[PDB]
Amino acid sequence: ANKQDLIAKVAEATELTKKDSAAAVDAVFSAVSSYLAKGEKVQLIGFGNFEVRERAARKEIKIKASKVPAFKAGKALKDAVKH
Amino acid sequence: ANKQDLIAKVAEATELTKKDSAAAVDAVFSAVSSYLAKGEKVQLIGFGNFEVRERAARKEEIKIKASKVPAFKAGKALKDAVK
């Protein structure tokens, strides 16, 4: 699925217009991105948590340190996917 | 930041009332969960991809079956935003 498919599902679920649904989807992921870029934790009860984690440089090949925007799924999501 | 903060961002960014914004945010994450539960990837350009990955099977000898788990792979825009 893609963003436009998500938008269509949101519209169908809420009966909001596709136009409002699209603005809402874009605002959600813009907001998560911005909070992560500010180095905040994003906790979404019933879904999971986004947080930037540091990955150390590794060592012929050398990988530099990185800041990885990472996701930890909640139990509700892990359960649904596994079943 | 948490779900309530995202809802505030949605209402601020969109035409939507606070109650409609909350419905919209919940519908977004319910939709993502519904796709992953079905085993379908969710690709969001300019944010990242939600995927379903294998958990390794492991080891009277006994085998714990391989499982499916949710995963997130940040996109280039998000990674650059964080770094």
Q: Do B5 and A78 touch (CB under 8 A)?
A: no
> Which experiment gave this structure?
X-ray
* Contacting residues for A51 by C-beta, under 8 A, at least 6 apart: A36, A41, A42, A69, A70, A72
Which domains, ranges and CATH numbers included, belong to chain A?
1-83 (4.10.520.10)
Contacts A83 to B, Cβ<8 Å = 37
Taking chain A, what is the end-to-end CA distance rounded to the nearest angstrom? 20
3-state secondary structure chain B: CEHHHHHHHHHHHCCCCHHHHHHHHHHHHHHHHHHHHCCCCEEECCCEEEEEEEECCECCCCCECCEEEEEEEECHHHHHHHC
* Distance (Å, whole) CA A76 – CA A73: 8
